[PDB]
Amino acid sequence: AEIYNKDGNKVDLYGKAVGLHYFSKGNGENSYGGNGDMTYARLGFKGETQINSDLTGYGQWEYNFQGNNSEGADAQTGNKTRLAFAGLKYADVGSFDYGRNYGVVYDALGYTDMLPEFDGDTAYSDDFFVGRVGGVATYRNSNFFGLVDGLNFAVQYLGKNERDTARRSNGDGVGGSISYEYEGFGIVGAYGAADRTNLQEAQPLGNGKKAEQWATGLKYDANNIYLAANYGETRNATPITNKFTNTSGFANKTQDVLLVAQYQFDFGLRPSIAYTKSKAKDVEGIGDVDLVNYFEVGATYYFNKNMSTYVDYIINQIDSDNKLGVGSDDTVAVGIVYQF
Template identity: 50%
Template sequence: MPMILVKKNPRGKVIRELSSEEETAVKTVCGLKKPATMAQHNLANDLLREMREYDAWLQCDCIPGDSPAMNFAALKNNTGTLYLSSFNHEHAPECPMYRQLSGNEEETSFGASRHPVSTRINYRNFLPPDDSNSVIRLQTRSAYHNGERSSVRKKRPRLGRLLLSLIEDAGLNKLDSLANPRIRTNYRECLDAIRQVTLQQEYIRGRSLSEIIHFRPGMSERSQERLMETLENSERHWPARRKHMFFQIFMAQHICRDAVEIHWANGNIQVFRPVRGISINGEAQGGIRPPYWVILAFCRSADGRIICSEGYAHALYQLTCPVHFAVQYQGKNGSAHGEGMTTNGRDDVFEQNGDGVGGSITYNYEGFGIGAAVSSSKRTWDQNNTGLIGTGDRAETYTGGLKYDANNIYLAAQYTQTYNATRVGSLGWANKAQNFEAVAQYQFDFGLRPSLAYLQSKGKNLGRGYDDEDILKYVDVGATYYFNKNMSTYVDYKINLLDDNRFTRDAGINTDDIVALGLVYQF
């Protein structure tokens, strides 16, 4: 089996196989250390540059099994030369790539890193070396690469350290006080705070970070090219021997290790697929703790195109708790006259209520939610003494519900049992009622959101000649189309499942189907 190039992230994904000429070249130049032809030297050079550009590993088949020997392409900063380095274990002794691995001076005797895995960025020295003209050198005795030993914590990528340094300088990682732990979580406010830092800090004397750090991920390819040409202008100062590149910072809800999606208000979706993938802080899979800070790096590829080379994402810290609760008190609104009269009295018995209290609790996790609510209110004298059905000292409700709201899907169901709280048209209130609701919706990328719902309310032992009766029962079919974040239109068709009978006529309950059309503008 030939040698192959594999992705670092996701680990082991095959990029391509090496040709026989490439394999011979890399084994001759980097392995055997024998004199090589100019063609072989150029092939090996191109291969290592490709590994650098795509953050790829070179996998050899000299050791069978699930843990093959691998090398990565490293760059020596002081000389600007490329070389291959091993990091997991040695090649087979008979392999031309074999080198004995030495210990790592960066580790303690227990295998821990001697240095912090994340340090602040120096804004004047954070740009990576320009390896476009780097040349190869022979492979020497290799040391373990700091970041790839399973026993050593991986160093945070340079891109991540840049983002976290900007967040720190903007004060977004600080509490106002323990008594008032305010954290800015408004997206625009957070981005504006970092933008101010880029205006104040310089990456070279007289040049602010705002020239290379931008907040416009929707920038067109033409604008990207113009920006890069401005940075590459020979008359403008640039850090010596550093790669020309620029960055975009934004917030995103949808992210994985291969791509990040931006869902614009008009329904369009913009996708970035960095060549080296996206490092996500503290997550093996990604996308489980939105929203995210995202920083993307852009540079020129070997063929001169502007590419998104790599990305880093960090969950936005928010002072939120997955458990929410609420308590509410409602004051008495009694009759305007007679017994139980109040200054805010109401003549319509259906608009009256006594003193009441209610509470709810919900739990949300990764799109799933569960909740419960309860309420209890005293009933007024009129409600119990004017001949309406439903008598009792209190009106009570008990509710439980489930929902799923993620991946453009919304599903929810709710069950409620009430006592003297569900209205039965003009007849009064059901002594006991069972209510059920369910809804399913899907949000298409182009702005359409269809909806299907079922609702039923059934009164139990209503009295006055009525037993168990359906108070409400229908299927709702509808759709909403979002033109942009402010304007939408909808159509809704209510399919009434109630029969026209003596009960519905006596209670004045509508049994007709209903169609509604609407246009909504939200300021």
Template identity: 45%
Template sequence: MKLKYMPLLLVPFYGFTQAAEIYNKDSNKLDFYGRLVARHQFSDTVSADGDKTYARIGFKGLTTINDTLQGFGQWEYQISGNVAEGQEGNHSRTRLAFAGLKHASLGSLDYGRNYGVIYDVESFTDILPVFGADTYTRPDTFMQLRAGGVLTWRGYDFFGLVEGLNLAIQYQGKNEDSSRAVRNQNGDGVGASLVWQSDYGLSLGTAYAGSNRTDAQQQKSGNNAGRAESLNAGIKYDTGKFLIGSVYAETRNMIWAGGSDWTLGDAGYGKWGAVTDRTRNIEVAAHYQFDNGFRPSVAYLQSRMDYNGISGNIVKYADISIRYFFNKNFSAHADWKINLLDDDSRVIKATGISTDNVLAAGMIYQF
């Protein structure tokens, strides 16, 4: 079987709709992409208020090895623009860095820092300009979002048997060195996703990931369970102009709630932080792209946790946003996060999670 043309990126490529081709010769192709986000946020919560400007750049490369085999790679980096000169180091980060091979009939295999398979389905609701898709997915939380040391195999059209049915299997090696924050550690884990995409805009998907928790996580997180797990299922309908997506997810022994350190307090009276025993998460988001460039969006997100006999919401908000595209490279946006958490709930009083609204406004240049 001869290898058909393969897009430069084999996993879903979110946030960028175009890239600048900087090299294409002798079966080698290199695209450069980026975005500059000039954004200001307004909130009574200090950490959510103020300048949030940043720049993001990356490249995607592809080389044809023979009629059935191609090599590929991607790197992406983000630089904060809201800190003093010389202090960017703690605020800038590598988002993606992976390389791999794709075979015409055997699928693709890549390794490095990449998206976890849980995000294959979570992406159904990640459509808002600023907020959204944040009830249970966080970077470097096992295989929920972007993660390090993941080996990913992807097969397309279910081995040629079912068009549009894509299977992914992922392994993550342990990351437990002392320089890594305890909440961002992980033991060995495996995950898988199954997503069906129809020709008329309907997508259905489910994904599972399970990992061992490190000794430090069991000893210092308020939760001594030996394994962390997550499972989600979602549906999306996308006509090109209208999009609506919905995801339901559950996690066990995985999601951090509360204070910024690992010091536990009295859950009834004092501030505390711990890894939840369980979370149940709902996300629904929709937008419509008008021909004149306007794209209004609405969303609802909720995460309810259980920990040590306590239950309550740790995420609950509605979102209203609008984005205007001047052209494919430049847009402006306003995104209003309407917090629906109860100030008087036991969980909020104990954890200190913010219940403030946030308004974000800005402009984006991308290529």
């Protein structure tokens, strides 16, 4: 909601309280989503100031406050800043921003990140260019310097992030994406490669000194319809754990498919049908193994722009004999959302 707006600056303080619960049999250990209360809230801000007619400066911070922790020792578990960046946009020259933001490959994955509850599977955090990452300088151009309506690109420079953890770490890399959108249609291609840190390499699984990820996407967005599909691959980027050996590393290779079909009725009900499969190749020891494999059926009802509720159902296709220990059980998410 725009709480402020005077002297060319407008602030939008936003957020949401989400009452959420996951239903999966057992202790949700062998299920897709786990089981139980998963309530949380979000608070963030989106500022934007008009330095003059062509120039705009802006910033954005979004945080994630878990709502399923005690007020005890575990009170902080799960909390975190998701985004944090400032930037500038100049006339038709493009925009530039730096901070914790979305990797460029997500310019593609974003297409199928539309399930009611469950977040796009391959769009992981602090995992190179696919999801939110720290210290990324990102340039974006729209309409090819205003010469070509609908043609946009982006390039992105990722700073090395040497964390205490091989999974949350990354070396320096570059990434770019080109997309084109003409009347309800959209096509995209994204790609980025990056150095792997000593620790990432000291890991038992995955072998390389460079990590890559690219995805392409196609979408039809219009007439209350939303059909979207993505296909991409990766090398030594995808984080995987062998639950048996308690071994971890990155998938040498993966092939990721995502499809999403949705319809927005005029009365508020938005049904969703999706399919996601990601399979690792050449995992050291196991060979080929599926990481994510399921169908999804669900529906969201929008009371209005501030209230909605939804049920998301995961028909997990993974099988009980999955070598990595990847869970085979179903998960049903029911949630109620208020937001501003």
